[PDB]
Design a protein around this ligand. Structure first.
Ligand SMILES: CCCCCCCCCCCCCCCCCC(=O)OC[C@H](COP(=O)([O-])OCC(O)COP(=O)([O-])OC[C@@H](COC(=O)CCCCCCCCCCCCCCCCC)OC(=O)CCCCCCCCCCCCCCCCC)OC(=O)CCCCCCCCCCCCCCCCC
Ligand SMILES: CCCCCCCCCCCCCCCCCC(=O)OC[C@H](COP(=O)([O-])OCC(O)COP(=O)([O-])OC[C@@H](COC(=O)CCCCCCCCCCCCCCCCC)OC(=O)CCCCCCCCCCCCCCCCC)OC(=O)CCCCCCCCCCCCCCCCC
Ligand SMILES: CC(C)=CCC/C(C)=C/CC/C(C)=C/CC/C(C)=C/CC/C(C)=C/CC/C(C)=C/CC/C(C)=C/CC/C(C)=C/CC/C(C)=C/CC1=C(C)C(=O)c2ccccc2C1=O
Ligand SMILES: CCCCCCCCCCCCCCCC(=O)O[C@H](COC(=O)CCCCCCC[C@@H](C)CCCCCCCCC)COP(=O)(O)O[C@H]1[C@H](O)[C@H](O)[C@H](O)[C@@H](O)[C@@H]1O
Ligand SMILES: CCCCCCCCCCCCCCCC(=O)O[C@H](COC(=O)CCCCCCC[C@@H](C)CCCCCCCCC)COP(=O)(O)O[C@H]1[C@H](O)[C@H](O)[C@H](O)[C@@H](O)[C@@H]1O
Ligand SMILES: CCCCCCCC/C=C\CCCCCCCC(=O)OC[C@H](COP(=O)(O)OCCN)OC(=O)CCCCCCCCCCCCCCC
Ligand code: HEC
Ligand code: HEC
Ligand SMILES: *C[C@@H](COC(=O)CCCCCCCCCCCCCCC)OC(=O)CCCCCCCC[C@@H](C)CCCCCCCC
Ligand SMILES: CCCCCCCCCCCCCCCC(=O)OC[C@H](C)OC(=O)CCCCCCCC[C@@H](C)CCCCCCCC
Ligand SMILES: *C(=O)CCCCCCCCCCCCCCC
Ligand code: FES
Ligand SMILES: [Cu+2]
Ligand SMILES: [Cu+2]
Lengths: 312, 163, 107, 92, 139, 223, 50, 158, 160
């Protein structure tokens, strides 16, 4: 009954997702109760037809019921305040910002596909002496001694002294699971660990949404400069297997072709995968080596052809 | 575009590259450079010939399979080199606007497109007759030469035509 | 009249060898060469030819506006159909003379 | 009140007795005021026919032909509606 | 115009409260301090309502109760010379067309068309404004 | 250069692998293969900003560059290393040569431009319309290096003018003519764009004829 | 409200024509070869940049 | 609807001399012949290079590149099994950057052909590239990568 | 006219090289008074007939069109009087509103002329106002039979 009453909400795979699903179930129950009573009122006042027995006498013509108005403007405030309190307590576990993530994934989303960096890994049980690279974060300070003019301008740069073509906000890592247009990226994560996602956009705003995480975030170009808390954490992922993930903000024309996967594997599988990726290998090769289907099993890199009626 | 001296210089297939167009003219060894006075009148005549200018276009090897050839013009092309008269088949303006990756020779005077891939037949605009295709080949030394003459009158059409 | 005092109609090929640097040593008709001479070499020749061409455009435009006036107001009826006819011939002549005029400097 | 009422004697010459009336066109007597509806019907039919005939030509695309068909169908539908309504006495 | 002014006074009070609370709770408890977009927008919509309500209050204090604003007012009380309301005019469509020309000139970055559209807008606004003041031709 | 290639690959990975795979092979029906296009093509396209294109249409429009000069050089070096092809001209220091591309002769450049370029652009470098949704952009914005690389590579529907077809001297002359025609003030008043008949007729009908008709309305009477 | 007309009745005529012609030029992006505005109705910032 | 399914920009070949042959798992890019010719033909018995780039499409690999020989006896010096979700650059196309400038497996799989038959620029010559997956005829062209014009003799008017 | 000759540049031939059969430009328009003939050339749909061993190119279509245009323009007053019956000596003008059918016909003709002129300019219109060149050509082709009808109807009703 819960699945049907959830209105097609996938059963979460994280503690945060489970808690959000429970809040959604409660809020939908409240909304359906309110809707049921209001629709009952409407379909019961629809029983007040103009009865032919109604002689030349108009209705009670009352209007203006102050006590009833007060009651029906007090109760909605109570309902929405209870819902707001539940919302706040659930929100509190939206980004706990635990300063000790078990694996940090640098999710950089460029125009029409994804890339995952594996910035850092630090298992609580003790493992994964791994770290991000960051030699490639090179700035584009246009601080030339002189510009077109002969002297004086000594232009530094448009924005904070730099150029919009900066890309310094982007972070890069040794293990990059770049997603090609013909190969859906598959970010592989260890099961049972705390996974942080550091979110960024190379070109334009778009949205990282794993539907089974019951949570999305908007990867913006420069979240730090836009006062956006791009980085967000997930306490745990219980269920293993492949979970589809999608782009949920306008990217451009190929906004519907940015699907990726978040394949949750066991911690030992993650050990093997990261070792085999440190060794020169691709994501598909590492998946095959850890004995898991290499290509995204929940989605395909569907046709680059503009459509069905195009003549190939 | 050299001002006056050696205005027309022999040409080689290697000079053009896939998806390239070059306006060529009918130059003869006798019509040497413009240094002399006997020359520079032959050269002026070549330049001012209404039906003289031709466009040599290099069809991409990948797109060579989309080419459809005309009757009596199947062997006119030298490999992937196609020579079509620049004079538009409709009122005779040059059709110089060559579009590659579409292979459409557009005329600016009245916006008529000719499909270069197929024999240069008009696929839009006032034109109704295809551009005349010059037979081309390479002579000794590899220079491009015409392998004949147009099998049809090349300028714009007129009453005494198509017979 | 001023323009004809400086214009030479001919296709006789000549290299410019004038003042206009962007066209030097280029074969051109004497008509184009003398149009360039009017534009550059002659004091106020550019202005005279520009006002001539603008007068041609205004001549055509005002003929069109006058034709619209008379047609819409019915000034062509019984007494003046001949006037309408000769005015139409005048409009045709103006059109073709403007054609020949901006065709005169071989461009 | 700084205006003087105008009066005019316009030389008249059809006697505007079979055609349009002042009720329909207030200034019928002052100038050419009615074109036979047959002229408009035949003109619309010929315009639609010309639009259809323009499909035959040198153009590989067919968006142009579909636009021609749509406009010709609109013209034919308008002419048919007008003709039918007039035949039935401007009914429906 | 007491109620007319009081509407905007209430709106101004609410918007001032909203701007103040937003500014405070964004200067603290936000990622980067004051948002500076919502804050400014709220402050200047408070200013919108404040200007309108202040003018309406000035008018209400300057005006004796109108029949419109007076409960228990008979129709004959307000009966009288209503002011000039513009009859038919074709200048609005010309103004709209001129502004559309300027707008397309801005969209398609055509400075010549922008200039033409601005000149047409000036002409059409002049026509609309002078429509009922142009005197008779003096010959 | 090693670091230049690394930077170019880095930018390529997060810019355009959605349209030409990490191997630079063209993604079928989204973008053409970059193998052999060359540093010159990459420079022209990215510097003009045309290429990081966010739609498939009749013609990819020009737009503000999405990469600075150093990043453009990184992209070009990466693509040259992967495919190998034409290289953008450069001066003695190493920067992309622009002044050096201004050919000495301008009459020759103008003749070449008219024979080859004006065909679709204009007499004086303005734009021109093409078959269906395409167009030739106005050259006034293109700097000499961009003009030279635009000749060297055929971006889209522009014939590819190889160095053999137009030797660097002829290309430099064409660049000089383009810059001269773009930066030359219009002699004889405001130059209405560059198109003569259409702008001139519009200007007549608006300025001259509105002036004449308004003056006629002023002088005469209404009745 | 019992009024005969609106406060500025030539202004509301302008408002309708500003609506009509303003609307037409927005929908007119379709006739262009590229198409109408591809970005969403919300038209978020970087996607709408040149 | 000029931005529909059939769009000019999307349906464009690269503006490069080499042809593209996507047939087979491995896609061939910028496949041309460097055969500098001083006369009508490149005479038989002269070795000319076969440039191209073999890009692997499927990461699951087709790195064999068995023979890729046709009329011309194409030999693959320094052959290697490079293509695995990557590129195999057989030679050094004119303007190619020496990304390494060192002997990495000697030459990078340079393909050279002893013609045994005249060829000339502007013609298309069939080459059968055969990987373990399959074989494809490519119809390679002749490309003068970065060579300038060869001075044509001055003309003596007659 | 002097102010225009000063401030506005008209036909800057120096930018336009000397005529050569090979050199071209994208604009290629005549003055506005011949722009309508050029637009007729552009719009008329490439209909050529081939009698026994001969050709009748698309140019003759426009030649006949111009002939018809001039003939009708010259012979309108006589056409007008044949149609209406007016053989009276008219010295008082008619207001265009007072003569609807003639006003409608004149509006229709002006609409056709403007459509032809903008069709001739379709190259620059397509270039600047981002419309496909084929789209402008076919807009002209369809509108040269649609826009005249729309303008006739609108002008007739407007006069009434
Ligand atoms: C299809 C439907 C959609 C159409 C979209 C186009 C809308 C714009 C065109 C209509 C504007 C004109 C109008 O409504 O008709 C008024 C006018 C009737 O006026 P009336 O009040 O009944 O006159 C009675 C007496 O004459 C006495 O009456 P009066 O006292 O009021 O005086 C006569 C009236 C009559 O004045 C006029 O007729 C002026 C005509 C202006 C036409 C503007 C053309 C804009 C291009 C539109 C393209 C289509 O008064 C004047 O204003 C005379 C001074 C002239 C002013 C000229 C101002 C130019 C402004 C340019 C601004 C820039 C806009 C660019 C966009 O209608 C016409 O006679 C003209 C026909 C319509 C023009 C077609 C344009 C093509
Ligand atoms: C941003 C867009 C700017 C919008 C500005 C127009 C909006 C104002 C509407 C509310 C004002 C009150 C009103 O009802 O207007 C009366 C009137 C409506 O007349 P009505 O409905 O028939 O009733 C009779 C009036 O109530 C009887 O009162 P009235 O006719 O005597 O109206 C008096 C003043 C009415 O008071 C005002 O409207 C103040 C004028 C301030 C507007 C200044 C433009 C600022 C924007 C430039 C930056 C963008 O009239 C004037 O004498 C001065 C009008 C000057 C307008 C100048 C606009 C030119 C724009 C191009 C500037 C070029 C630079 C950019 C490059 O509206 C106008 O005259 C303004 C025309 C609309 C222009 C839209 C431009 C597109
Ligand atoms: C044969 C034919 C007419 C084919 C169709 C091509 C065509 C003309 C399409 C319309 C052009 C337009 C209006 C494009 C904008 C986008 C569009 C279609 C919007 C919807 C149209 C619509 C119903 C809008 C509602 C409000 C409305 C009426 C807006 C009109 C806006 C405009 C542009 C008004 C002015 C009309 C106008 C000037 C159109 C261009 C015509 C010409 C020949 C301009 C000539 C000209 C040019 C081309 C210059 O470059 C130039 C440069 C420097 C100085 C002068 C000029 C100059 O005069
Ligand atoms: C007063 C003059 C105004 C004109 C009056 C006439 C009104 C009648 C309008 C008739 C409309 C007819 C439109 C059809 C036209 C047509 O047939 O062409 C198409 C393009 O469709 C279009 O957008 C058409 C949009 C039509 C819009 C109508 C515009 C009305 C405006 C002009 C009115 C405002 C007037 C303002 C006057 C200003 C005052 C003046 C003083 C396809 O081109 P193409 O590009 O090649 O498409 C390829 C595919 O085919 C192929 O599949 C695929 O492969 C692709 O490759 C693709 O390219
Ligand atoms: C009684 C006669 C009164 C006539 C008024 C005369 C106007 C005086 C204008 C100013 C003085 C003379 C300027 C001469 C120097 C000069 O030419 O002026 C250009 C500017 O040009 C533009 O942009 C246009 C700027 C907009 C203002 C001018 C618009 C006036 C129009 C509206 C008058 C005609 C009427 C038409 C009505 C239209 C409406 C129809 C309903 C400026 O350079 P630029 O801007 O960079 O030009 C680019 C090259 O650089 C680059 O290569 C090149 O490739 C191009 O991109 C070029 O634009
Ligand atoms: C309301 C319902 C309107 C209809 C709603 C559906 C609209 C869908 C339109 C485009 C979708 C994108 C596909 C874009 C590709 C086109 C489809 C295709 O694949 O067909 C190929 C040819 C070119 O291919 P070709 O090789 O060069 O030539 C082939 C050689 N034999 O196009 C064609 O047939 C053109 C056929 C496309 C349909 C026509 C669209 C214009 C309709 C205008 C209606 C206006 C009515 C006016 C009313 C006043
Ligand atoms: C149609 C044939 C054609 C001819 C021939 C041609 N062009 Fe172009 N040109 C184009 C087209 C189409 C584009 C658009 C390319 C793009 O947007 O990627 C273009 C783009 C350009 C640009 C880019 C301008 C900018 O700001 O982005 C320049 C510069 C240029 N051409 C100059 C030249 C020069 C120099 C020649 C010397 C002969 C020439 N063209 C010949 C059609 C042509
Ligand atoms: C699908 C969107 C798209 C993206 C994003 C894109 N390209 Fe392209 N690319 C194309 C298309 C389509 C063409 C051919 C048409 C054109 O260039 O307008 C092309 C052509 C090119 C060319 C010219 C090819 C030739 O033969 O002249 C170069 C160089 C190029 N791309 C490099 C790049 C670089 C570098 C980037 C990243 C900065 C990039 N592209 C991003 C689609 C794209
Ligand atoms: C790609 C295909 C598929 O789409 C279609 O077929 C839909 C086409 C709908 C019909 C459009 C007809 C053109 C508008 C005619 C308006 C009347 C003109 C006469 C009066 C001057 O189709 C296409 O090729 C392109 C599809 C996009 C078409 C966009 C049309 C946008 C209309 C815009 C120019 C404004 C119209 C002005 C209406 C004026 C009437 C109110 C005053
Ligand atoms: C400028 C005036 C244009 C005058 C054309 C004079 C045409 C003479 C040659 C016609 C001919 O028989 O040649 C073969 C023909 C092409 O093929 C056919 O047999 C079937 C064709 C079906 C289409 C018929 C349309 C006829 C329309 C004209 C009668 C209307 C003219 C007005
Ligand atoms: C061409 O490049 C653009 C194609 C746009 C595809 C979507 C079709 C939109 C049609 C909606 C109706 C247009 C307005 C109708 C006015 C009568
Ligand atoms: S002059 Fe070339 S199509 Fe008409
Ligand atoms: Cu998305
Ligand atoms: Cu995205």
């Amino acid at each position: 009954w819960s699945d049907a009453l959830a209105l097609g909400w996938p059963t979460g795979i994280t503690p945060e997702a489970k808690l959000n699903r429970e809040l959604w179930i409660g809020s939908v129950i409240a909304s359906f109760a309110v809707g049921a009573i209001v629709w009952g009122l409407i379909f019961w006042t629809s029983a007040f037809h103009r009865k032919k027995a109604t002689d030349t006498e108009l209705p009670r013509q009352f209007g203006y019921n102050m006590p009833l108005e007060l009651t029906l403007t007090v109760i909605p405030f109570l309902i929405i305040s209870v819902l707001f309190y539940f919302t706040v307590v659930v929100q509190e576990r939206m980004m706990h910002k635990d300063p000790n993530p078990e694996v940090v994934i640098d999710v950089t989303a460029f125009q029409w596909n994804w890339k995952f960096g594996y910035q850092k890994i630090a298992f609580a049980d003790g493992s994964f002496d791994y770290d991000g690279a960051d030699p490639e974060r090179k700035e584009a300070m246009t601080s030339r001694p002189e510009g077109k003019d002969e002297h004086g301008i000594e232009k530094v740069g448009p924005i904070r002294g730099m150029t919009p073509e900066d890309r310094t906000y982007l972070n890069f890592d040794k293990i990059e699971t770049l997603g090609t247009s013909s190969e859906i990226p598959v970010l592989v994560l260890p099961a049972g660990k705390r996974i942080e996602f550091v979110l960024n956009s190379a070109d334009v705003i778009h949205g990282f949404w794993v539907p089974e995480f019951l949570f999305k975030r908007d990867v913006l170009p420069e979240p730090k400069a836009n006062n956006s808390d791009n980085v967000f954490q997930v306490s745990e992922i219980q269920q293993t297997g492949a979970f589809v993930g999608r782009c949920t903000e306008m990217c451009g024309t190929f906004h519907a072709m940015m699907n990726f996967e978040v394949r949750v594997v066991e911690p030992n599988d993650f050990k093997a995968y990261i070792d085999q990726r440190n060794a020169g290998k691709t994501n598909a090769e590492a998946l095959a080596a850890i004995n898991q289907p290499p290509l995204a099993i929940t989605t395909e890199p569907f046709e680059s052809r503009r459509g069905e009626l195009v003549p190939q | 575009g050299r001002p006056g001296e050696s205005p027309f210089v022999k040409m080689r297939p290697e000079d053009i590259d896939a998806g390239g167009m070059e306006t060529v003219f009918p130059w003869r060894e006798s019509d040497g450079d413009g240094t002399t006075v006997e020359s520079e009148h032959k050269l002026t005549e070549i330049a001012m010939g209404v039906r003289n200018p031709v466009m040599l276009i290099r069809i991409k090897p990948a797109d060579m399979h989309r080419v459809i050839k005309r009757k009596g013009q199947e062997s006119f092309n030298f490999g992937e080199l196609f020579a079509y008269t620049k004079v538009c088949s409709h009122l005779g303006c040059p059709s110089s606007l060559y579009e590659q990756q579409t292979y459409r020779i557009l005329c600016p005077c009245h916006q008529s497109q000719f499909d270069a891939l197929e024999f240069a037949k008009p696929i839009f605009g006032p034109a109704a007759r295809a551009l005349a295709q010059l037979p081309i080949t390479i002579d000794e030394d590899g220079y491009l030469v015409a392998n004949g003459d147009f099998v049809e009158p090349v300028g714009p059409a007129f009453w005494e035509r198509k017979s | 009249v001023w323009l004809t005092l400086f214009f030479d109609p001919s296709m006789a090929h000549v290299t410019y060898d004038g003042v206009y640097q962007p066209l030097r040593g280029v074969q051109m008709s004497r008509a184009y060469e003398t149009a360039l001479d009017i534009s550059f070499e002659v004091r106020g020749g550019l202005f005279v030819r520009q006002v001539h061409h603008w007068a041609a455009l205004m001549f055509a435009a005002s003929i069109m506006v006058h034709l619209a006036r008379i047609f819409f107001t019915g000034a062509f009826r019984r007494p003046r159909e001949a006037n309408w006819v000769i005015g139409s011939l005048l409009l045709i002549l103006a059109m073709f003379e403007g054609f020949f005029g901006y065709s005169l400097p071989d461009d | 009140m700084s205006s003087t009422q105008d009066r005019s004697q316009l030389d008249p010459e059809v006697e505007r007795h079979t055609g349009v009336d002042v009720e329909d066109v207030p200034s019928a007597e002052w100038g050419w005021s009615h074109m036979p509806i047959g002229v408009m019907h035949i003109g619309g039919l010929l315009s639609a026919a010309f639009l259809l005939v323009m499909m035959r030509g040198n153009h590989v695309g067919h968006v142009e032909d579909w636009f021609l068909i749509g406009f010709a169908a609109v013209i034919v539908a308008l002419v048919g509606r007008n003709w039918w309504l007039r035949r039935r006495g401007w009914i429906r | 115009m007491h109620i007319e002014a009081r509407l905007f006074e209430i709106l101004t009070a609410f918007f001032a409260l909203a701007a103040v609370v937003y500014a405070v709770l964004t200067a603290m408890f936000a990622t980067g301090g004051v948002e500076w977009a919502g804050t400014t927008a709220l402050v200047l919509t408070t200013g919108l309502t404040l200007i309108t309500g202040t003018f309406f209050r000035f008018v209400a204090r300057r005006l004796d109760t109108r029949p419109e604003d007076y409960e228990d007012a008979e129709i004959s009380d307000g009966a009288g010379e209503l002011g000039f309301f513009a009859p038919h005019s074709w200048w609005p469509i010309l103004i709209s067309l001129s502004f559309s020309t300027a707008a397309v000139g801005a969209a398609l970055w055509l400075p010549w068309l922008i200039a033409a559209g601005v000149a047409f807008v000036i002409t059409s606004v002049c026509g609309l404004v002078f429509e009922y003041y142009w005197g008779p031709e003096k010959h | 250069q090693s670091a230049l290639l690394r930077t170019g690959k880095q930018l390529f990975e997060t810019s355009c692998v959605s349209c030409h795979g990490a191997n630079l092979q063209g993604v079928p029906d989204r973008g053409p293969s970059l193998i052999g296009t060359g540093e010159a093509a990459v420079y022209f396209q990215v510097s003009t900003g045309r290429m990081p294109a966010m739609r498939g249409e009749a013609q990819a429009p020009s737009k503000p560059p999405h990469f600075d000069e150093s990043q453009i050089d990184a992209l070009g070096a990466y693509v040259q290393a992967n495919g190998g092809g034409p290289t953008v001209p450069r001066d003695d220091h190493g920067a992309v040569a622009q002044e050096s591309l201004i050919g000495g002769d301008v009459a020759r450049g103008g003749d070449l431009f008219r024979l080859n370029c004006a065909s679709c652009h204009n007499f004086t470098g303005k734009g021109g319309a093409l078959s269906s949704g395409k167009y030739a952009p106005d050259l006034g914005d293109a700097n000499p290096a961009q003009i030279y690389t635009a000749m060297l590579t055929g971006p889209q529907n522009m014939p590819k003018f190889s160095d053999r077809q137009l030797t660097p001297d002829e290309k430099r002359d064409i660049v000089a003519y383009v810059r001269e025609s773009a930066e030359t003030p219009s002699y004889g008043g405001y130059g209405l764009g560059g198109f003569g008949p259409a702008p001139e007729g519009m200007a007549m009908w608006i300025i001259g004829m509105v002036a004449a008709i308004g003056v006629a309305m002023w002088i005469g009477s209404r009745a | 409200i019992g009024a005969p007309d609106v406060a500025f009745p030539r202004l509301n005529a302008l408002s309708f024509w500003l609506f009509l012609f303003g609307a037409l030029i927005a929908i007119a992006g379709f006739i262009t070869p590229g198409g109408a505005a591809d970005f969403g109705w919300t038209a978020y910032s970087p996607l709408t940049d040149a | 609807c000029s931005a529909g399914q059939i769009s000019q920009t999307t349906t464009q070949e690269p503006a490069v001399n080499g042809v593209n042959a996507q047939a087979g798992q491995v896609s061939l890019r910028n496949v041309h012949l460097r055969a500098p010719q001083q006369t009508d033909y490149v005479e038989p018995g002269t070795t000319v290079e076969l440039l191209f780039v073999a890009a692997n499409d499927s990461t699951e690999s087709n790195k064999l590149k068995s023979i890729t020989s046709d009329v011309g006896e194409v030999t693959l010096t320094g052959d290697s099994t490079v293509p695995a979700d990557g590129v195999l650059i057989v030679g050094e196309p004119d303007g190619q950057i020496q990304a390494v400038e060192n002997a990495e497996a000697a030459d990078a799989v340079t393909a050279e052909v002893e013609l045994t038959k005249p060829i000339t620029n502007g013609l298309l010559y069939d080459f059968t590239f055969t990987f373990e997956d399959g074989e494809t005829t490519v119809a390679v062209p002749i490309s003068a990568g970065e060579q300038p014009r060869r001075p044509v003799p001055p003309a003596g008017p007659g | 006219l002097g102010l225009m000759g000063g401030l506005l540049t008209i036909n800057p031939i120096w930018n336009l090289g000397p005529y050569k059969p090979s050199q071209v430009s994208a604009g290629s328009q005549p003055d506005f008074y011949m722009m309508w003939t050029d637009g007729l050339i552009r719009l008329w749909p490439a209909w050529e007939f081939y009698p026994f061993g001969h050709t009748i190119p698309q140019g003759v279509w426009v030649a006949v069109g111009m002939g018809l245009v001039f003939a009708l323009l010259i012979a309108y007053p006589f056409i007008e009087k044949k149609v209406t019956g007016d053989d009276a000596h008219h010295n008082l003008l008619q207001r265009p509103r007072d003569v609807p059918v003639r006003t409608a016909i004149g509006s229709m003709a002006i609409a056709l002329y403007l459509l032809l002129t903008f069709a001739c300019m379709n190259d620059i219109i397509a270039l600047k106002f981002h419309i496909s060149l084929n789209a402008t050509t076919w807009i002209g082709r369809i509108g040269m039979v649609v826009l005249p009808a729309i303008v006739y109807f609108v002008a007739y009703r407007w006069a009434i």
